[PDB]
Amino acid sequence: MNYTETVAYIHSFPRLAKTGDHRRILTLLHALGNPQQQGRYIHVTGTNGKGSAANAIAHVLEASGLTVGLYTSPFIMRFNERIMIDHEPIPDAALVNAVAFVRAALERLQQQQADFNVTEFEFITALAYWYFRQRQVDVAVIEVGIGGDTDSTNVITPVVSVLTEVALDHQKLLGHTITAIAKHKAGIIKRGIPVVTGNLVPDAAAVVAAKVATTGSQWLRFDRDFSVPKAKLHGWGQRFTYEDQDGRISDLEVPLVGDYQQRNMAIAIQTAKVYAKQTEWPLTPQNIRQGLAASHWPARLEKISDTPLIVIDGAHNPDGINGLITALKQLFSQPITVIAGILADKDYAAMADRLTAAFSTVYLVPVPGTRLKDSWQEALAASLNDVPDQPIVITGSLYLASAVRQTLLG
Numbered sequence: 001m002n003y004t005e006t007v008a009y010i011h012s013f014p015r016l017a018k019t020g021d022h023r024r025i026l027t028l029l030h031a032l033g034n035p036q037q038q039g040r041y042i043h044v045t046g047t048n049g050k051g052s053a054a055n056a057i058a059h060v061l062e063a064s065g066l067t068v069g070l071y072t073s074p075f076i077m078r079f080n081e082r083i084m085i086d087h088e089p090i091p092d093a094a095l096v097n098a099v100a101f102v103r104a105a106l107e108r109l110q111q112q113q114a115d116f117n118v119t120e121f122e123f124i125t126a127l128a129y130w131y132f133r134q135r136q137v138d139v140a141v142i143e144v145g146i147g148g149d150t151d152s153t154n155v156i157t158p159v160v161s162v163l164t165e166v167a168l169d170h171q172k173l174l175g176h177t178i179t180a181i182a183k184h185k186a187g188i189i190k191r192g193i194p195v196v197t198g199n200l201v202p203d204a205a206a207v208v209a210a211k212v213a214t215t216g217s218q219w220l221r222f223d224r225d226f227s228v229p230k231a232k233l234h235g236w237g238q239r240f241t242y243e244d245q246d247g248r249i250s251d252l253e254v255p256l257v258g259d260y261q262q263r264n265m266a267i268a269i270q271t272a273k274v275y276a277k278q279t280e281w282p283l284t285p286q287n288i289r290q291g292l293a294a295s296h297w298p299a300r301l302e303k304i305s306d307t308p309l310i311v312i313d314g315a316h317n318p319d320g321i322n323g324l325i326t327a328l329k330q331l332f333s334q335p336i337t338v339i340a341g342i343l344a345d346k347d348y349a350a351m352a353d354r355l356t357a358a359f360s361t362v363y364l365v366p367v368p369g370t371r372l373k374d375s376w377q378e379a380l381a382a383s384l385n386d387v388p389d390q391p392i393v394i395t396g397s398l399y400l401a402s403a404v405r406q407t408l409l410g
């Protein structure tokens with residue numbers, strides 16, 4: 001198979017039941033020589049901020065001289081972005097050869113167990129684990145797909161775990177209460193392994209304190225052990241100060257806007273320091289400053305057009321919507337239009353009340369492959385014609401942001 005066929009092959013996998021015992025992926029992995037049991041890992045979970053945190057942790061450790069695998073989702077411009085090494089997406093040719101190796105092993109399994117199969121995410125995760133070992137990365141930063149305990153990625157023992165935050169999202173999968181969702185996320189916390197977390201709402205904090213008690217894990221929490229005591233906009237980015245039990249690193253800069261990113265970044269920094277410590281590896285404030293400076297992350301409050309002014313974002317659950325509003329409020333001191341593809345979660349109605357309550361013009365649209373408009377293209381055309389003086393912010397799952405970015409830029 002060539003590259004195009006290979007990708008199409010990856011997207012052809014079935015949606016199987018959700019056991020949560022990882023037997024399917026463990027079967028494929030075993031046939032791949034158990035790459036998940038070799039090397040080192042950093043496991044990242046959380047309702048919002050997983051990718052931004054994972055991306056920065058990788059940049060900081062890369063700056064310190066380590067070869068780092070990064071596994072994130074969803075891709076924004078193209079598939080290859082899901083598996084990166086030192087931030088270079090897996091080469092087309094390399095993906096073709098990788099897909100062929102895994103397919104061959106899969107085939108051998110099916111010839112021994114006639115009805116055996118894996119899901120698309122299971123295939124990709126196994127391929128990623130195998131790829132990271134083939135290239136012998138020093139460490140792989142792994143973003144959990146959904147939840148924590150039952151995710152296909154949860155077949156590893158990391159050096160450090162990360163739980164950015166817990167907010168309501170993915171209920172028909174994780175739970176209907178913060179406590180329930182929290183218990184699922186805490187599942188990536190392992191015996192004796194440190195866990196770095198954001199500032200968690202009380203209910204979630206209790207679940208985590210309870211878990212660390214059982215695992216005996218060292219627990220570093222934003223606003224307790226490490227923090228961001230100062231920050232300010234600096235272009236389409238932020239300049240801030242990080243502080244933890246070792247002191248302060250001043251004048252740090254990240255090319256990201258949104259107050260919540262100060263949290264994601266602080267989590268990344270604390271996490272990388274813990275990694276370096278647990279592995280007896282050198283990590284300087286210079287390494288950290290360099291990595292943060294390189295921490296570009298598409299579709300995260302990204303201005304992709306100046307005239308007209310267009311920003312895209314992936315906020316689509318109430319917490320993200322709340323973070324989005326607060327941010328937009330600090331970024332614009334003029335009327336703006338917001339096009340939201342939140343027509344998906346029940347969550348929808350309340351989020352829309354919050355948007356229309358805070359902004360001048362709000363359009364609601366579906367997500368590609370799912371006030372009212374039939375598509376984001378229609379809402380944009382509407383905005384540019386009825387409110388030409390209003391910048392446009394397009395938000396919803398990253399799938400909508402991605403479709404918009406691909407369309408307007410690639």
Ligand SMILES: Nc1ncnc2c1ncn2[C@@H]1O[C@H](COP(=O)(O)OP(=O)(O)CP(=O)(O)OP(=O)(O)O)[C@@H](O)[C@H]1O
Nearest residue numbers: 047048049050051052073260300314315320323397398
């Ligand atoms: N600490 C934080 N507090 C509040 N909001 C935050 C946040 N960190 C990130 N966000 C919001 O989430 C969006 C995506 O950020 P990230 O890529 O870091 O998220 P995740 O990796 O958790 C997304 P997904 O669940 O993979 O995707 P998908 O759900 O799109 O399928 C941002 O554009 C922003 O709206």
Ligand SMILES: [Mg+2]
Nearest residue numbers: 047048169170
């Ligand atoms: Mg999500």
Ligand SMILES: [Mg+2]
Nearest residue numbers: 050051073074
């Ligand atoms: Mg993500």
